[PDB]
Amino acid sequence: SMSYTWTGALITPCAAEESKLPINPLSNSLLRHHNMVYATTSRSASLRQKKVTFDRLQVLDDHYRDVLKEMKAKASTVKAKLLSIEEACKLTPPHSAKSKFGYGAKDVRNLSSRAVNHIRSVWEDLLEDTETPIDTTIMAKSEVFCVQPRKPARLIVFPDLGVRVCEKMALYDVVSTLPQAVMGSSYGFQYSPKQRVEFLVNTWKSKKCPMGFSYDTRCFDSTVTESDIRVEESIYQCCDLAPEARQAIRSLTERLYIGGPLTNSKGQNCGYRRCRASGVLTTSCGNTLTCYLKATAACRAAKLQDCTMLVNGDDLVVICESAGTQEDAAALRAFTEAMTRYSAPPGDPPQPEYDLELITSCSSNVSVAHDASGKRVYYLTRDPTTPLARAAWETARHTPINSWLGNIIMYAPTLWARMILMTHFFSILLAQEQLEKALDCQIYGACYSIEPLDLPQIIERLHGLSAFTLHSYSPGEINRVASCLRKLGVPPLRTWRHRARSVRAKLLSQGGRAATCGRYLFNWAVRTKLKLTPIPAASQLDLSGWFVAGYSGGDIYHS
Numbered sequence: 001s002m003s004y005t006w007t008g009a010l011i012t013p014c015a016a017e018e019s020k021l022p023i024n025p026l027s028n029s030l031l032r033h034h035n036m037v038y039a040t041t042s043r044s045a046s047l048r049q050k051k052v053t054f055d056r057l058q059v060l061d062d063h064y065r066d067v068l069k070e071m072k073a074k075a076s077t078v079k080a081k082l083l084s085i086e087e088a089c090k091l092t093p094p095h096s097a098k099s100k101f102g103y104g105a106k107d108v109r110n111l112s113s114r115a116v117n118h119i120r121s122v123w124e125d126l127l128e129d130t131e132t133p134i135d136t137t138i139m140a141k142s143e144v145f146c147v148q149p150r151k152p153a154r155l156i157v158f159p160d161l162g163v164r165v166c167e168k169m170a171l172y173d174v175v176s177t178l179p180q181a182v183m184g185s186s187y188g189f190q191y192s193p194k195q196r197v198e199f200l201v202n203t204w205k206s207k208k209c210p211m212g213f214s215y216d217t218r219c220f221d222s223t224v225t226e227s228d229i230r231v232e233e234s235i236y237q238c239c240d241l242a243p244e245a246r247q248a249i250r251s252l253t254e255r256l257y258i259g260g261p262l263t264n265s266k267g268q269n270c271g272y273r274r275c276r277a278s279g280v281l282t283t284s285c286g287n288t289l290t291c292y293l294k295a296t297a298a299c300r301a302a303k304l305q306d307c308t309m310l311v312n313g314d315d316l317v318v319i320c321e322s323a324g325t326q327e328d329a330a331a332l333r334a335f336t337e338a339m340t341r342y343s344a345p346p347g348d349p350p351q352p353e354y355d356l357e358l359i360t361s362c363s364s365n366v367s368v369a370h371d372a373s374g375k376r377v378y379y380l381t382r383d384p385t386t387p388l389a390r391a392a393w394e395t396a397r398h399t400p401i402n403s404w405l406g407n408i409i410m411y412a413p414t415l416w417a418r419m420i421l422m423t424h425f426f427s428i429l430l431a432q433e434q435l436e437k438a439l440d441c442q443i444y445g446a447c448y449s450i451e452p453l454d455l456p457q458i459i460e461r462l463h464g465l466s467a468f469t470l471h472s473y474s475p476g477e478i479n480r481v482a483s484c485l486r487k488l489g490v491p492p493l494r495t496w497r498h499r500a501r502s503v504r505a506k507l508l509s510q511g512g513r514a515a516t517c518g519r520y521l522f523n524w525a526v527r528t529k530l531k532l533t534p535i536p537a538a539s540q541l542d543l544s545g546w547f548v549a550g551y552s553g554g555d556i557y558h559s
């Protein structure tokens with residue numbers, strides 16, 4: 001069937017849409033070429049619509065069926081729990097889109113009478129009505145990027161807040177536990193960046209002659225078929241479930257997940273969806289299971305030897321045993337034709353790689369640096385272009401989510417996050433005297449409230465003390481960073497070092513947690529290094545839950 005059907009009504013914005021980076025003294029000190037930074041808007045929606053609208057092709061074979069059964073066998077060991085209304089409410093983000101039924105996220109979290117009562121009625125409706133398609137709103141996603149030598153906005157589809165709370169009750173536990181049970185070490189969201197690097201490195205070194213490749217599916221969500229979504233449900237159904245959860249899952253599958261009507265911000269009928277909606281609770285888990293199922297089966301059909309996969313939603317990376325240059329190239333081609341038959345055609349053509357550091361998965365690549373002892377240490381990095389552009393945007397405009405904070409946490413060991421992001425934002429927080437202000441950021445799609453002053457402990461727990469001592473980065477990594485800066489008009493690293501020295505001194509003079517940030521975060525800035533010992537508060541933070549599962553588009557808030 002067609003992934004989408006359109007009536008002609010336009011995808012409209014619910015407010016003014018900013019697309020240009022403001023000329024601000026704070027953002028200008030970080031990035032001067034402001035005209036190179038832009039934010040996607042509804043103005044390019046039609047372009048996106050064109051790319052994601054097509055008739056899907058899907059042929060399932062014995063390999064697919066074999067792998068599916070293997071997966072259901074593992075799903076069968078799972079017992080999922082129904083979340084209470086209260087628990088589901090507490091998982092709703094403070095700034096989540098309000099319901100059209102007279103209440104918002106605030107009311108949901110405070111368990112207000114109107115919100116709870118409506119949520120109960122929506123739940124009872126899921127138990128009673130197994131067929132009526134649930135309404136969804138379609139919006140053009142607002143994302144920031146750097147112009148290329150531009151990207152159309154992504155389309156986000158989500159149901160009303162009441163429905164979202166119900167999804168949590170019936171499926172939060174399932175999407176939080178089932179993926180790991182089914183895919184084991186292949187489920188990427190169970191790993192912190194350091195553990196992900198560890199897994200990739202060990203897997204790579206565990207092969208006699210390793211060969212790896214990233215596989216980019218062309219607009220994955222639109223390739224997900226009704227069959228795929230019902231197969232996904234068949235896996236969920238293997239869990240032990242409360243009767244009402246089993247029905248809610250059955251109802252949500254047919255009324256929402258497999259497709260439904262699309263309504264714009266103006267309340268007009270935009271068309272119909274018959275593929276994956278980006279904004280429902282099962283999207284991350286569903287895409288991961290679907291991608292893993294198809295790829296595992298495709299690997300068998302292609303005859304790839306000793307395959308080890310790592311999947312994060314629609315992002316896939318495979319490491320296997322090389323069978324020779326020409327043999328690998330032909331096998332990868334076969335793999336792609338098998339994925340294509342499974343309705344997961346390639347976006348960027350896949351290519352075999354024989355150097356782990358040259359593989360990009362989850363927009364990241366493995367690289368090497370050295371610790372104080374001089375020992376080699378692997379860590380996760382990426383091209384800093386998007387992170388810097390977004391840091392500049394969030395510097396000039398207020399944003400609910402701070403990608404810069406999430407980037408510092410996730411890429412704390414990198415040359416760019418340390419010299420630029422930390423320096424830039426700590427200097428601003430110092431000037432505005434807001435170091436003790438907790439800020440929101442997302443990790444694997446879930447929203448977290450984090451205090452900047454706790455970054456030293458956080459970083460130590462997730463990355464280890466080496467994150468504060470890495471040096472002698474690879475020439476390739478240094479060049480990528482340096483060239484990126486010249487491109488964006490970001491001051492050269494020498495300028496950042498000078499600014500860092502001043503930020504460090506200021507932080508130390510304040511003492512307390514502030515001084516700790518100066519000592520650990522900026523020890524790289526001084527020649528007379530200080531002794532960095534394990535932070536007492538570090539080995540005490542409850543980071544359990546940070547890297548358990550993916551929740552992108554899931555409307556999840558962890559507190």
Ligand SMILES: O=C(O)c1ccc(Cl)cc1NS(=O)(=O)c1ccc(Br)s1
Pocket residue numbers: 414415418419469470471472473474478493494524525
């Ligand atoms: O050690 C490096 O690879 C390196 C790369 C770029 C620059 Cl500007 C300085 C470098 N040497 S350095 O100042 O000791 C340093 C170590 C860690 C950081 Br972050 S900066």
